[PDB]
Design a binder for this molecule. Sequence first.
Ligand SMILES: [Ca+2]
Ligand SMILES: [Cl-]
Ligand SMILES: [Cl-]
Length: 294
Amino acid sequence: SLGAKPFGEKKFIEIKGRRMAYIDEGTGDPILFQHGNPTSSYLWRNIMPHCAGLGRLIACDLIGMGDSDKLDPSGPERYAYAEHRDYLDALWEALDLGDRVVLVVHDWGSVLGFDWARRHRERVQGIAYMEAVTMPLEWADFPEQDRDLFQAFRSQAGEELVLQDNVFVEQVLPGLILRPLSEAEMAAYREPFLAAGEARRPTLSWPRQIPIAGTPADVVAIARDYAGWLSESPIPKLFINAEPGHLTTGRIRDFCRTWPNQTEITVAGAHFIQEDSPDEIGAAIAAFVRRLRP
Ligand SMILES: [Ca+2]
Ligand SMILES: [Cl-]
Ligand SMILES: [Cl-]
């Protein structure tokens, strides 16, 4: 169902001298849920219950996000993709995931998850993805009404928009969910980001890292790498398409629809589709996992 209550209890682990927070419930092979910007493990709260008893249910808060520690000192050079990956790689190593992981990814969680999967192909049993970065982007893939705002994040105006005014959390997030959020739901999303300034840096560093029109060159290459790999990998896949959807439409959806061994369903939603169709998403992922783990 819908609901504002989180799934399980937050656990904490020391990684590269910082505390990272994660949910880890049940036993068996992991079903690993990865949020992106500006969200947290909370994004998956009404989806994870659908996988009850199908394995070990895990949702990690990225560094600087959810209940995970802020980097100190933070600044414009902090929270780049490479830095997030170092912390997540280390957390995933520490969680002892074994070699039959099912990944469930969204947004920046898809860039991180697709990259990890390419680098650890032998350990990946299945990949479920939605509203994901399926390949390097051009401004033309970028939803038309988002172009000016994201270009602004990727300019000097970004600090005032995000660090001062919390635009990603307060405007982009509800703007890309079709149903109205409750007070409690917004409270959960704004909590990691209540303080103006560097506390909000991850939500600004992320839009600056999106691989668009060749920049930044390092994230473009990582995305180019996994796009080529996924288009050839026989690993089973579940593509959860959205209507109207947002990011994974047009060219980049045309692209991910060429991926082998893929089941697709369509659900209602824009970008943060977890808030619009949690039960349909959860049911689809559960069915996917059941078939992978008969
Ligand atoms: Ca809305
Ligand atoms: Cl095993
Ligand atoms: Cl972003």
